[PDB]
Amino acid sequence: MIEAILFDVNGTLAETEELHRRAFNETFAALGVDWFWDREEYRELLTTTGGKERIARFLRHQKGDPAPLPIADIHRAKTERFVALMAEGEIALRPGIADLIAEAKRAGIRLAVATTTSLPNVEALCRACFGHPAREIFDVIAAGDMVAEKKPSPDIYRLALRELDVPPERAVALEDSLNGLRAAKGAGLRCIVSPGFYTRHEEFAGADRLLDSFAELGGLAGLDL
Ligand SMILES: O=C(COP(=O)(O)O)[C@@H](O)[C@H](O)COP(=O)(O)O
Ligand SMILES: [Mg+2]
């Protein structure tokens, strides 16, 4: 059996990206700029992880209004919006996720998050979906700007593994996206993928398992081999 499970957040714990998109767009509108990311645009922008990095990519060549604030300030406002939206309880965990975490806890298996997303989003999602602070759910939280290079860099996973003190051969990652799979694999981890809306078009070569739902894992034993 594995000794630790490392979870991605967006698209893994919950289907969140349309809520991120909303938060971006509503922030743009509040700032009085003409920017608006439709699904087609957002699907492409999602291949750059981290909201600051995504905004920067967009600004490099978009031909609408110039940024009126630093990126970090735009992103901070977006995060406050996302947190507020997340709290409303419209988003639930993806099927299978709650049950896996409960089984892991009963088995004494160590749990981490390993995410590109801002730390407040992790807290918001945990409070909403689990009813507790994130550090009551996960033993280790590796998020956001804790590393210099985001997925597909393995660095966030290497951070999480160091903090867990579990060798990669005894752990497993759950992911939804190709950049996530690449990051996990680059850290030496077996990786179970279940994609979503934005990510299903991707090919997931090297995934240990590729599932339509985490409810198909089959319990902790499905994380083995
Ligand atoms: O690329 C990401 C995927 O998160 P994960 O690694 O959990 O799949 C994030 O940048 C989110 O799109 C937005 O969150 P922020 O705006 O907070 O970055
Ligand atoms: Mg993800």
Nearest CA-CA partner of 129 in 164, 94, 177: 94
Burial of 203 (0-12, 13-18, 19+ CB in 10 A): exposed
Distances (CA, A) of 190 to 6, 17, 88, 174: 10, 24, 34, 9
What's this structure's resolution in Å? 1.3
Tally the C-alpha atoms within 13 A of residue 9's C-alpha that lie toward its C-beta. Answer: 31
Out of 7, 20, 179, give the residue to mutate to test ligand 1, the one with the largest number of ligand atoms within 8 Å of its CB: 20
All structural domains of the chain: 1-14+92-225 (3.40.50.1000), 15-91 (1.10.150.240)
CA 116 to ligand 1: nearest atom: 6
86 CA from centroid of ligand 1 (Å): 14
CA 23 to ligand 1: nearest atom: 16
User: ω before 195 within 30° of 0 (cis)?
Assistant: no
- The whole-angstrom separation of Cα 218 and Cα 67 is 48
Strands 171-175 and 140-142, bridge-based pairing = unpaired
Q: Are 125 and 96 in contact (CB under 8 A)?
A: no
Please, which residues bridge with residue 171 across strands?
Answer: 4
For residue 16, how far is the Cα from the chain centroid?
A: 9
CA angle 223, 212, 172 (to 5 degrees): 25
3-state secondary structure string across the chain? CCCEEEECCECCCECCHHHHHHHHHHHHHHCCCCCCCCHHHHHHHCCCCCHHHHHHHHHHHCCCCCCCCCHHHHHHHHHHHHHHHHHCCCCCCCCCHHHHHHHHHHCCCEEEEECCCCHHHHHHHHHHHHCCCHHHHCCEEECHHHCCCCCCCCHHHHHHHHHHCCCHHHEEEEECCHHHHHHHHHCCCEEEECCCCCCCCCCCCCCCEECCCHHHCCCHHHHCC
- The whole-angstrom separation of Cα 142 and Cα 127 is 17
Residue written as tokens 């078009």?
201
Q: Are 146 and 156 in contact (CB under 8 A)?
A: yes
Side by side, the strands of the sheet bearing 171-175 are 140-142, 110-114, 4-7, 171-175, 190-193, 209-210
User: Does residue 27 have its Cβ closer than 6 Å to ligand 1?
Assistant: no
Token output for 77: 């406002």
Please, which residues bridge with residue 3 across strands?
Answer: none
Ligand nearest to the CA of 19: 1
Q: Are 9 and 122 in contact (CB under 8 A)?
A: yes
165 contact partners, CB below 8 Å, separation of at least 6: none
Nearest CA-CA partner of 150 in 9, 50, 12, 76: 50
- The whole-angstrom separation of Cα 13 and Cα 221 is 19
CA angle 8, 204, 103 (to 5 degrees): 40
116 CA from centroid of ligand 1 (Å): 5
117 CA from centroid of ligand 1 (Å): 4
- The whole-angstrom separation of Cα 73 and Cα 77 is 6
User: Does residue 8 have its Cβ closer than 6 Å to ligand 1?
Assistant: yes
Please, which residues bridge with residue 7 across strands?
Answer: 113, 174
